[PDB]
Structure 1
Amino acid sequence: RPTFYRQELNKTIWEVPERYQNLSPVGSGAYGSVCAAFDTKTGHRVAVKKLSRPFQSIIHAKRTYRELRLLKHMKHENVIGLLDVFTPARSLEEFNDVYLVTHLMGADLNNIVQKLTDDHVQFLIYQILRGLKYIHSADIIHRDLKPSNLAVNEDCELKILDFGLARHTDDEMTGYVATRWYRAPEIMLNWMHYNQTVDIWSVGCIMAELLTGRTLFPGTDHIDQLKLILRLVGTPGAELLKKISSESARNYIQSLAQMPKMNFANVFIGANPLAVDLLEKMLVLDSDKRITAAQALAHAYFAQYHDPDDEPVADPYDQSFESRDLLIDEWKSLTYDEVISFVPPP
């Protein structure tokens, strides 16, 4: 066990191993209570997150377990990974705080998206799809890909963030808000049981915005946003209508006058024809028919970066706990086991 020291940060007393020095608050609070630090063991600048009230309720205790399980599993160059996890507690009975350590990531894709060449768009979207192929191979659905969840460095290298945090609330999704502009229509409107294909819609929205400098579907509310979507991709045909299992939602969408899909070469004026082709394959209303991440990596738009021997998949991820009902102290004991069993990367 390392020696720990105490310091007052972010309105509480932080207690951390001596290896972490020069702690200072960082960020806007989006991912929790976070401080930057220098890790003297590795030489890395790191982010240290101290969870607030991780076990106050069943929902909070299970969410804490979920975040730790997901972060411990992710081992890929284009996905956030866990450098360390620690608690000052010496036993389960005194366990009450969890600290998570990752690489410090200053800028996100907003902070860049600058004059982006087509070569830049190729490299950025390639890296998102490489990470997504890995995530999806573990049967994990991201659900919230958007520019603020994509960390990028000075060499254009990218990592995907946002695993195991609280589900977004109805109020967070209301109005003229970026948290809804990237969502697939079937999840925005609860049309049907959704699956991993929601994430490919989000990638299409991001790619369009890198190419034009403008939000693709900046709706002022759910209904305005649906109208923007259907104007570009067309109103649904009978085949998709059958798959909308919500009778109410199916009835509303039939109240709208029918519209054909637009010509994407006339929407994305001047863009690489291979980029136009890929956008047409991602932004398909029927999710069954969208291109997958593994298929998209082989598209000719990425010919300069694609290497099928360097696009790895994930070890299997058991998420049977998601359907399990346990008491607070049982989720807490599972979390403690995962803290003490952590093995750091090479």
Structure 2
Amino acid sequence: GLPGMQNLKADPEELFTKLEKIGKGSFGEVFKGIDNRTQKVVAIKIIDLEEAEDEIEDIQQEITVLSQCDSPYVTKYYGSYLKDTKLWIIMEYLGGGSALDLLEPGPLDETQIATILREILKGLDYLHSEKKIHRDIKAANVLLSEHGEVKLADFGVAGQLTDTQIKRNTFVGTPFWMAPEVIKQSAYDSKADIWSLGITAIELARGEPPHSELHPMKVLFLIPKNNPPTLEGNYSKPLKEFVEACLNKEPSFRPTAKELLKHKFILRNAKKTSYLTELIDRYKRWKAE
């Protein structure tokens, strides 16, 4: 049974006004929508179930993981509807778009970088405390509200640790951001997210992850065999050390999310999230051209 599944008599085309496409998830297409009862904006993920299966388990898993999260740092899930062969997944709308989108007008400053990383860390701390691993941390999966709030999204490949399953070994993620132990399919846990966080830190600083000019297949041997990436360029030493802390080949040498919240880069540079509205305004003016 799918968590949050609504009465099959309920017609989502009547309950929601479906508007323009705003992106593509690991599964399904995502639209801006209006809740016709409250008039709030929602995000609507639509998946065609007849074209799918072999992905249906994964879709169920994503919804299950979402339904089990209750955090200001994780996109809220409002339920699912079936219309003929299509599943409508109703999600919290984050009007600012992704951190990746917000990078298009130009570089971030280190206050912005620290603030976004701090909020991602709050989300990871929550997830890891719940014995969940995101496994696809990257700037495209970091979403901002219109108020500058920062939340984690796309739990399409998220994993769950139990007391009989202390580690995972599944090959999932986005290659440039994947930890060496995940690529090698060694036993791994929440520390894999910390590595991905390190890559995301470089992405927020430089605009792209390491190896971004290479074919994804090449990083399948490059990441396990090479020394870890470092942040190159004129960035503060605390930021460079934050990145180095995350990007260690030995998972036990990586700090926890909780520990990184106290890292000197974060404490010295992060400010209130409301300031990130400037970043949204910049994007708005930019795409206005």
TM above 0.5, yes or no, is: yes
TM-aligned CA distance change 1:306 to 1:25, over 3 Å: closer
Name stretches of at least 5 consecutive residues in structure 2 with no aligned partner.
Answer: 1-5, 160-170, 273-289
Q: Does 1:198 align with 2:192?
A: yes
Please report how far the alpha carbon of residue 60 of structure 1 lies from its aligned counterpart in structure 2 after TM superposition: 4.9
TM-aligned CA distance change 1:165 to 1:33, over 3 Å: farther
Q: Does 1:63 align with 2:58?
A: yes
Please report how far the alpha carbon of residue 49 of structure 1 lies from its aligned counterpart in structure 2 after TM superposition: 2.7
Give, in whole Å, the separation in 2 of the partners of 1:165 and 1:277: 29
Residues 268-316 of structure 1, C-alpha deviation per residue, up to 9 Å, x if partnerless? Answer: 3332222122222111001121111111112122226599xxxxxxxxx
Match of residue 46, structure 2, among 27, 44, 50: 50
Residues 84-117 of structure 1, C-alpha deviation per residue, up to 9 Å, x if partnerless? Answer: 33457xxxxxx97643211234522221122311
Match of residue 260, structure 2, among 288, 296, 309: 296
Give 1:142's aligned amino acid: H
Give, in whole Å, the separation in 1 of the partners of 2:248 and 2:92: 36
Alignment partner, residue 248 of structure 2: 284
Please report how far the alpha carbon of residue 154 of structure 1 lies from its aligned counterpart in structure 2 after TM superposition: 5.0
3-state SS, counterpart of residue 39 of structure 2: coil
Please report how far the alpha carbon of residue 160 of structure 1 lies from its aligned counterpart in structure 2 after TM superposition: 1.1
Give, in whole Å, the separation in 2 of the partners of 1:36 and 1:297: 33
Please report how far the alpha carbon of residue 41 of structure 1 lies from its aligned counterpart in structure 2 after TM superposition: 3.2
Give the paired residue count. Answer: 250
Query: Mean alpha-carbon deviation: is it higher for 197-206 or for 154-163?
Result: 154-163
Please report how far the alpha carbon of residue 55 of structure 1 lies from its aligned counterpart in structure 2 after TM superposition: 11
Superposition pairs of residues 1-346 of structure 1, within 5 angstroms: 15-16=11-12, 18-21=14-17, 23-30=18-25, 31-53=27-49, 59-87=54-82, 98-105=87-94, 107-113=97-103, 114-153=106-145, 155-164=147-156, 179-190=174-185, 192-218=186-212, 219-223=214-218, 226-227=221-222, 231-233=226-228, 268-303=232-267
Alignment partner, residue 281 of structure 2: none
Give, in whole Å, the separation in 2 of the partners of 1:273 and 1:208: 13
TM-aligned CA distance change 1:306 to 1:155, over 3 Å: closer
Tell me if structure 2 keeps the 8 A contact 1:50–1:100.
yes
3-state SS, counterpart of residue 202 of structure 1: helix
The Cα RMSD (Å) is 3.6
TM-aligned CA distance change 1:287 to 1:27, over 3 Å: same
Tell me if structure 2 keeps the 8 A contact 1:80–1:161.
yes
TM-aligned CA distance change 1:289 to 1:166, over 3 Å: closer
Give, in whole Å, the separation in 2 of the partners of 1:25 and 1:126: 31
Give, in whole Å, the separation in 2 of the partners of 1:96 and 1:227: 42
Give, in whole Å, the separation in 2 of the partners of 1:151 and 1:50: 19
Larger radius of gyration: 1
Please report how far the alpha carbon of residue 193 of structure 1 lies from its aligned counterpart in structure 2 after TM superposition: 1.2
Give, in whole Å, the separation in 2 of the partners of 1:273 and 1:227: 26
Give, in whole Å, the separation in 2 of the partners of 1:180 and 1:56: 23
Please report how far the alpha carbon of residue 217 of structure 1 lies from its aligned counterpart in structure 2 after TM superposition: 3.1
Give 1:129's aligned amino acid: L
Please report how far the alpha carbon of residue 211 of structure 1 lies from its aligned counterpart in structure 2 after TM superposition: 1.9
Between the aligned residues of both structures, percent identity stands at: 21
Give, in whole Å, the separation in 2 of the partners of 1:56 and 1:224: 28
TM-aligned CA distance change 1:61 to 1:159, over 3 Å: same
Query: Mean alpha-carbon deviation: is it higher for 99-108 or for 76-85?
Result: 99-108
3-state SS, counterpart of residue 83 of structure 1: strand
Alignment partner, residue 276 of structure 2: none
Tell me if structure 1 keeps the 8 A contact 2:44–2:88.
yes
Give, in whole Å, the separation in 2 of the partners of 1:120 and 1:96: 42
Structure 1 or 2: more strand by fraction: 2
Tell me if structure 2 keeps the 8 A contact 1:3–1:17.
no
Residues 207-237 of structure 1, C-alpha deviation per residue, up to 9 Å, x if partnerless? Answer: 012223342233434445644675543xxxx
TM-aligned CA distance change 1:292 to 1:20, over 3 Å: same
TM-aligned CA distance change 1:48 to 1:275, over 3 Å: same
TM-aligned CA distance change 1:4 to 1:37, over 3 Å: farther
Give, in whole Å, the separation in 2 of the partners of 1:54 and 1:293: 39
Give, in whole Å, the separation in 1 of the partners of 2:50 and 2:195: 33
